[PDB]
Amino acid sequence: WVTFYWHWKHITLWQGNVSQFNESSTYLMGWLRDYLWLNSSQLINGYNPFGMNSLSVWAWMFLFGHLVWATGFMFLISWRGYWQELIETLAWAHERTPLANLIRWRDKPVALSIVQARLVGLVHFSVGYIFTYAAFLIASTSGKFG
Amino acid sequence: YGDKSVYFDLEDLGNTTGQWDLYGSDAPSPYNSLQSKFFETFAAPFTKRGLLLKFLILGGGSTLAYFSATASGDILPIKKGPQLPPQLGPRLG
Amino acid sequence: MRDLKTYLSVAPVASTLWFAALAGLLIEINRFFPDALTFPFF
Amino acid sequence: INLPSLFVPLVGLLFPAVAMASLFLHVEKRL
Amino acid sequence: AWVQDPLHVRPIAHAIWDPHFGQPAVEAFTRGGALGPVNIAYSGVYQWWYTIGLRTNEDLYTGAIFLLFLSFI
Amino acid sequence: VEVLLGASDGGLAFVPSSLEVSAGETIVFKNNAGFPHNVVFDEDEIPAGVDASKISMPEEDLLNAPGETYSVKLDAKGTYKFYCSPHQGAGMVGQVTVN
Amino acid sequence: DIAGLTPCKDSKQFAKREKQSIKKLESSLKLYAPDSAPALAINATIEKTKRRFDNYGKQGLLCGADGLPHLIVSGDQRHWGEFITPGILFLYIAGWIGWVGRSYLIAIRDDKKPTQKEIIIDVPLATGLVFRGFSWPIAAYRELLNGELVAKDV
Amino acid sequence: PEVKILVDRDPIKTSFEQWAKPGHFSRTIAKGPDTTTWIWNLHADAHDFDSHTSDLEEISRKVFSAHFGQLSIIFLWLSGMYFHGARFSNYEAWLNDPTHIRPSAQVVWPIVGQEILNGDVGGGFRGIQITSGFFQIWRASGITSELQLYCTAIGALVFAALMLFAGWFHYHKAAPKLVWFQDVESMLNHHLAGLLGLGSLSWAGHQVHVSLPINQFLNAGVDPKEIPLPHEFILNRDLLAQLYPSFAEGATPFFTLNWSKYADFLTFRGGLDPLTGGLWLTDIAHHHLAIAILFLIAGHMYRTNWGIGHGIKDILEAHKGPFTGQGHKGLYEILTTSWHAQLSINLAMLGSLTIIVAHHMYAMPPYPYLATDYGTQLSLFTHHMWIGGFLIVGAAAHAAIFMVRDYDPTTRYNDLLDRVLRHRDAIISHLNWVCIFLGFHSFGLYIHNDTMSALGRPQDMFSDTAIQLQPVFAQWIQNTHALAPGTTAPGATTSTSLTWGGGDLVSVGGKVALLPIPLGTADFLVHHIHAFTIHVTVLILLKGVLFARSSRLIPDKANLGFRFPCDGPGRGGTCQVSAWDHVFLGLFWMYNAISVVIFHFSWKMQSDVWGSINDQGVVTHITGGNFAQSSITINGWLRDFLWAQASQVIQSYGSSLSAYGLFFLGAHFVWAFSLMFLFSGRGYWQELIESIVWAHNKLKVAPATQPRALSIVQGRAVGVTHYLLGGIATTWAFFLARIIAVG
Ligand code: CLA
Ligand code: CLA
Numbered sequence A: 001w002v003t004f005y006w007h008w009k010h011i012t013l014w015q016g017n018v019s020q021f022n023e024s025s026t027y028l029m030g031w032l033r034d035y036l037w038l039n040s041s042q043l044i045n046g047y048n049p050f051g052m053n054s055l056s057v058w059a060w061m062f063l064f065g066h067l068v069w070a071t072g073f074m075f076l077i078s079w080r081g082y083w084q085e086l087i088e089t090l091a092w093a094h095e096r097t098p099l100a101n102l103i104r105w106r107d108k109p110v111a112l113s114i115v116q117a118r119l120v121g122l123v124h125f126s127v128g129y130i131f132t133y134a135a136f137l138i139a140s141t142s143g144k145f146g
Numbered sequence B: 001y002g003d004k005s006v007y008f009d010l011e012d013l014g015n016t017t018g019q020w021d022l023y024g025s026d027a028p029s030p031y032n033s034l035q036s037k038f039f040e041t042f043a044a045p046f047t048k049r050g051l052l053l054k055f056l057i058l059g060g061g062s063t064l065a066y067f068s069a070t071a072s073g074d075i076l077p078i079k080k081g082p083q084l085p086p087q088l089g090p091r092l093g
Numbered sequence C: 001m002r003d004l005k006t007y008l009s010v011a012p013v014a015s016t017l018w019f020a021a022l023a024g025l026l027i028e029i030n031r032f033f034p035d036a037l038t039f040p041f042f
Numbered sequence D: 001i002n003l004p005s006l007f008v009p010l011v012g013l014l015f016p017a018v019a020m021a022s023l024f025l026h027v028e029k030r031l
Numbered sequence E: 001a002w003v004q005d006p007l008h009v010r011p012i013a014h015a016i017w018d019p020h021f022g023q024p025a026v027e028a029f030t031r032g033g034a035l036g037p038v039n040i041a042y043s044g045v046y047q048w049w050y051t052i053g054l055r056t057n058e059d060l061y062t063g064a065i066f067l068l069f070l071s072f073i
Numbered sequence F: 001v002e003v004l005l006g007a008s009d010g011g012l013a014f015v016p017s018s019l020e021v022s023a024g025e026t027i028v029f030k031n032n033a034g035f036p037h038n039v040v041f042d043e044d045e046i047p048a049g050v051d052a053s054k055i056s057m058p059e060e061d062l063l064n065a066p067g068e069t070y071s072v073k074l075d076a077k078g079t080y081k082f083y084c085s086p087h088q089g090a091g092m093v094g095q096v097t098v099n
Numbered sequence G: 001d002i003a004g005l006t007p008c009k010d011s012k013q014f015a016k017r018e019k020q021s022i023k024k025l026e027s028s029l030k031l032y033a034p035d036s037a038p039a040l041a042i043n044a045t046i047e048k049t050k051r052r053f054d055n056y057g058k059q060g061l062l063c064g065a066d067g068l069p070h071l072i073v074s075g076d077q078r079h080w081g082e083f084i085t086p087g088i089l090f091l092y093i094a095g096w097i098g099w100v101g102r103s104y105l106i107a108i109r110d111d112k113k114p115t116q117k118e119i120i121i122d123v124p125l126a127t128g129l130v131f132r133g134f135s136w137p138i139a140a141y142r143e144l145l146n147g148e149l150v151a152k153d154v
Numbered sequence H: 001p002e003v004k005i006l007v008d009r010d011p012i013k014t015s016f017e018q019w020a021k022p023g024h025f026s027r028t029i030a031k032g033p034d035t036t037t038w039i040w041n042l043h044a045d046a047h048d049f050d051s052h053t054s055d056l057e058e059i060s061r062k063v064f065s066a067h068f069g070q071l072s073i074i075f076l077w078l079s080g081m082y083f084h085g086a087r088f089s090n091y092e093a094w095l096n097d098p099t100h101i102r103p104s105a106q107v108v109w110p111i112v113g114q115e116i117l118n119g120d121v122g123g124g125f126r127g128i129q130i131t132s133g134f135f136q137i138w139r140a141s142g143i144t145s146e147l148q149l150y151c152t153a154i155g156a157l158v159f160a161a162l163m164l165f166a167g168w169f170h171y172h173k174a175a176p177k178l179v180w181f182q183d184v185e186s187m188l189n190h191h192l193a194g195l196l197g198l199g200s201l202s203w204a205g206h207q208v209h210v211s212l213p214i215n216q217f218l219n220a221g222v223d224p225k226e227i228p229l230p231h232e233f234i235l236n237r238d239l240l241a242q243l244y245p246s247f248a249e250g251a252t253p254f255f256t257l258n259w260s261k262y263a264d265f266l267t268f269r270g271g272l273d274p275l276t277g278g279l280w281l282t283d284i285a286h287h288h289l290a291i292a293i294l295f296l297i298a299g300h301m302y303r304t305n306w307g308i309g310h311g312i313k314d315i316l317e318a319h320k321g322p323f324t325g326q327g328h329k330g331l332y333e334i335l336t337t338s339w340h341a342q343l344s345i346n347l348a349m350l351g352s353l354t355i356i357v358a359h360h361m362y363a364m365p366p367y368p369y370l371a372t373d374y375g376t377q378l379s380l381f382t383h384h385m386w387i388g389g390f391l392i393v394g395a396a397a398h399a400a401i402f403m404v405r406d407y408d409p410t411t412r413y414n415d416l417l418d419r420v421l422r423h424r425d426a427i428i429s430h431l432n433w434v435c436i437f438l439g440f441h442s443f444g445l446y447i448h449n450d451t452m453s454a455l456g457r458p459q460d461m462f463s464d465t466a467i468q469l470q471p472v473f474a475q476w477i478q479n480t481h482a483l484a485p486g487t488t489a490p491g492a493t494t495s496t497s498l499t500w501g502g503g504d505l506v507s508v509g510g511k512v513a514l515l516p517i518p519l520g521t522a523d524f525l526v527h528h529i530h531a532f533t534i535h536v537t538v539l540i541l542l543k544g545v546l547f548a549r550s551s552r553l554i555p556d557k558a559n560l561g562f563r564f565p566c567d568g569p570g571r572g573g574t575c576q577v578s579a580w581d582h583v584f585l586g587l588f589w590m591y592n593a594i595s596v597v598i599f600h601f602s603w604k605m606q607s608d609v610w611g612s613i614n615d616q617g618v619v620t621h622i623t624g625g626n627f628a629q630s631s632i633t634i635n636g637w638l639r640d641f642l643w644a645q646a647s648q649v650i651q652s653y654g655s656s657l658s659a660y661g662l663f664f665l666g667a668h669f670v671w672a673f674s675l676m677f678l679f680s681g682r683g684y685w686q687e688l689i690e691s692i693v694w695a696h697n698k699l700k701v702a703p704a705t706q707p708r709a710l711s712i713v714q715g716r717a718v719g720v721t722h723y724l725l726g727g728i729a730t731t732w733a734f735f736l737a738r739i740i741a742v743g
């Protein structure tokens, strides 16, 4: 919230269009449309079926941060029991197959711990968060350069 | 073990725990001796764990180093470099 | 009747009737004094 | 002769290979 | 180049060497008057180092050497 | 004269955004990229020809698909400012006169 | 004036907004029969919109550069109608609600099966209790002074 | 042995005694509540009849009368729809000019300025444009006045009353007993022949006399009020003889077997009506006639009382082979003593059916002026897809409930069920591998395309111009279908749809009803994405069912019951090791799958089929074929589909589509809100409620029903339901706002 506020106020001040914020900042559709959807055109047009430009690396990272974030949901929603039983049937499958049971693991595969999974999910969530917002911020200010 | 209905016996735990090998051949070398004597004489110096690992790592490393430090422009556009004049930024450039 | 009076005072029904009455009251109030951003009497 | 042409593959390809092979070897067997 | 006209040139962070890059990407990323694909710095180290006194590349080289010395110690 | 709504870089502007055409000269607002681009006149100022629908494209309905062209004709002495209601907040506004 | 704002009645952007609003509705009235149900409904809301703007002008609201009536809550006496008298009214009503609820909870706390009287409201007791909220401020003041509003022993 | 009506008189007396008592069925509930958790339990186990008791007779009596109650609710809903179409609609105006007036059968009261939602739908009417497609049904049935709609509404009202009364009657006065329910042979004989056979024969009878002539008159251009009333078409027959000459012979063709003399109104044309953009009504009538004959014969298979017929037990236990031991022996005893088995079978089949219905209705539009009503088409497809998905997930839920509660090899042993339980690990391992492989080679292609495009290397991309992945099998099949009429379906003139091919675009009122749909590389990619998502949700649900009783993790999972939090953080952690938790995930993956499906449908339709036709025959589509080149990378979906299509809903504020914008934002909110329940655990919340309770106790305002945080299972349930509500509602708002604004 803090950084959204700062960025929008300044991105409207740098265009000499402060009335745009002053008027559309008082309702949340204004935040969605006039800030997020509006300032995201160049970024998502970093590469398209008609070529790419210097913003492409951000357009890529922007989607990267969306992927990471989303997979962070897995470790946060799905819980250990489910995965543990899936892993155990995977272990059966590996031990039972020709030409590959000749290879043996050295630690029995286990699902992640409970606290370990909460940690991994939080790390994914925050990394995705940081990366997608950094991509958007740098591409939306760098695109207009003002 | 396997006396009509029983399948458990302390004397033969491996049979009881299914420690079989379901697909091993127990057959003699299908390769002709002459052929065997040609390979294990030429492929011998590569069968030492530390030796093979160190040689593999360093040889492949210098392989990659040479092949990328001396690649030509028609292989990697990254070394061909730009071929056009550059544009200007929104105000800078 | 006695049991109907009881059931009509169970929590969900009591609260739906209460909130329907409250909604009616507020709706009528704003139907008579619409677009009120302040208290203009005193 | 272009210095990136040498250090970016070695540090991006060779070094992680060597380090991960060594660290797997160290972590995955008993002393 | 940046100390000569701080307002009309973009600062460069470091060069790009990515064998996965295509020709149009090579042409698209060569900015700032460089001879190849580069990244544009947004850390603000150019303005910081310019404010405190550094002017030439020799200054930055002495600085980097001194800092390697310091971290070794 | 042909005006491209939206830039190849995805920038929300007109191409050229500001220009001057001759009298009774038709101006074509074409869509280049970034579409739902809708060209809507300022309706404010613009001495004479004060109709709204004559040059304006009604809100809600806008240009559809990648390349679309809403043909206007002006033919009014004076200067007019054509913008895009969804994007006029990102600076996608333009001024076009006919002296 | 306060915070650089100007009296909406004398502002220009406030008027421009009113005329623009009224303008679009008039367009909706057109393309139908002049005295039709839909047209009559559109007229009604046009008059309603004109009344709202005149009411805003009359009440002396403050308008900024967008012409929107801003609300002052600093305590300036020219503006108590915006926040403070509605605030006192709210506090009264909310104290009414909370005091009646607390009164009820205390009254039913003495039966053997008190949860029975919580999932199934004793409406006769509730209707006996609702109107003490009218005097809830005096009752609560005297309960605080008595020392019986806050439970000791906890 | 023989079959008869067998009843019990007044098993339970109607009374208000148990209404006063909350949770009378549960002994623990009946007594009363100590904490807030008791209130939640009261609702969670209200309809779980098989746990309130153990008698099958009582369970089935309750089930019967609950079905009656549900039928009554459905009838009330139908009567509400018909009454709103009669009183608060512009149905007659729409009937006069269908392709200019927008259908709308709901107005709002002018209370707080909400009358802005009463938008201009045309026809001297201001209301909320509806997408139910009810106007198309009423027009296809022949309804021309609002008097007919009033009569229909009142008839459905009295039918709802009748259904409610029958529900009361068959539970409190005359309740059947177990041997009456456990008769499935006669039940099937009656539902096949009586409900579906007679039902469809009766509907074909309606269409032959009412819809065919009235729609003929309407398509001839007659003013709707100048059309004869339907009963006239029955009284005066030459009225029909004029439109349809072979109504002159009058049923003697039906007995001379000169059925060809009926070729007038019983056709096999196929394709669409070039005037209405729907199927030929003379084709639909013939269809229902044949359907009726088929079902009427089919409801005569099972033996009830007269020797002839089939014993289902015999058919089942006749089927067995060398791979399956004694398969199908013992299933008849399983499918007649457990309601959950039947429920899961029927739920799976009904979900499959609903989704087939969605596809066939988009492809072969059955109603007049439906195809060119883009909003109705999109909404109908999306709604039926969602319904089908939910039903299919419920199938798995109840299969698991059966496995946990009613499966018993001591008394009811079946061989196939046992064998599958015995190699469940092989099953799940192979399904796991298939999911992984399919996920790598469908979504991995999208990631490869995205990076190939971002590295300025489009030639290396998996596209129609760089590296083609052509669905040669689908193309071959649809070309086989296009060539079918005349070659291998000689009695048909047009292919069964227009998506097959042959050219023959059909338009209505300057809008495109249908044209051949082309399949390129993007279609290949997205179809494999579909296969992937379906396989993964199947994996989750099947793993939940097969491992519901026991696993190598916890050896006595059935004793913990079908639904439970865990068995402690032992063996490493057993969070959500129960069958119910598997259903909770499947809903997440079902959501993903159906979302991707409806996005695919919407984009492909707005890109290659819908659009406006013009004077030369130049078709400008909604998006100029942007699906063939932009849908191959994820950036294309985010930019060309969501960002582009999303603009309509964002600009909805200040107009009559403002409610859609409001629902967009509100659904975003409630979706994000679900995450609070889905990411946290009840321990933190209990510990916080502790101090809140302290704050209350400090002021003698603490409640007696002790406030507890929700159960672990309830928290997951609140989290999944809010998530689904949020996501589905935001998609609903987006679709509707977009297709009503651009359509
Ligand atoms: C933390 C400081 C730092 C960082 C982040 C980078 C980052 C980068 N350097 Mg670099 N470099 C550094 C310090 C650093 N350098 C120093 C102090 C020197 C000596 C003056 C060099 C000399 C150097 C050369 C010659 C080249 C790069 C290149 C590169 C780029 C390609 C990646 C690579 O090949 O690795 C770096 C390759 C090296 C040989 C660096 C070795 C020197 C450092 C001190 C190694 C430190 C390793 C240490 C044991 C681990 C530290 C822990 C922590 C970093 C995890 C990359 C952006 C290449 C390039 O230009 O890309 C276009 C290139 O050719 N660097
Ligand atoms: C975007 C977030 C996300 C992602 C990427 C996944 C991914 C996956 N899920 Mg998951 N899931 C998610 C969200 C996500 N889920 C959420 C929010 C929930 C809560 C409801 C679930 C619940 C869930 C369940 C219950 C299950 C899965 C399963 C799976 C796996 C399916 C098998 C497969 O597709 O193989 C292929 C892998 C992919 C398609 C991922 C992308 C692969 C990338 C593009 C390849 C790149 C390789 C790259 C070169 C790596 C080298 C990099 C180098 C630097 C190291 C898969 C890895 C199922 C499973 O386990 O499968 C057996 C399973 O049962 N998910």
Ligand code: CLA
Pocket: H064, H067, H068, H069, H071, H180, H186, H187, H190, H191, H193, H194, H195
């Ligand atoms: C030709 C005979 C016939 C017909 C038409 C039906 C029709 C129906 N049965 Mg039924 N049934 C029959 C014979 C028949 N059954 C026999 C012989 C048995 C076994 C003895 C059963 C046992 C049975 C069970 C256990 C259930 C049904 C159910 C249903 C309903 C299914 C839901 C539906 O499709 O909604 C379609 C809606 C309509 C068709 C609306 C019209 C409704 C008409 C008026 C129904 C009248 C038919 C009825 C048999 C009349 C005889 C009763 C008479 C004495 C008044 C449906 C209305 C389900 C149900 O009860 O739902 C409540 C269900 O649970 N049936």
Ligand code: CLA
Pocket: H043, H044, H045, H046, H047, H048, H049, H347, H390, H391, H392, H393, H394, H395, H397, H401, H563, H580, H583, H587, H721
């Ligand atoms: C013919 C369809 C059908 C039938 C008859 C049943 C019947 C039954 N199901 Mg079931 N189920 C179905 C379909 C069906 N299901 C489908 C399609 C799914 C997939 C979602 C499920 C998944 C499912 C689960 C996971 C469970 C059941 C359970 C049960 C049993 C108890 C249900 C209960 O009383 O809970 C009470 C009912 C409620 C609390 C209603 C909840 C309100 C919903 C969630 C909100 C819906 C929002 C609304 C649509 C819009 C918002 C309104 C709001 C904004 C005002 C019961 C025998 C439970 C069981 O234990 O079996 C023994 C069980 O846990 N079912």
Ligand SMILES: [Cu+2]
Pocket: F005, F006, F036, F037, F038, F039, F084, F087, F092
């Ligand atoms: Cu625009």
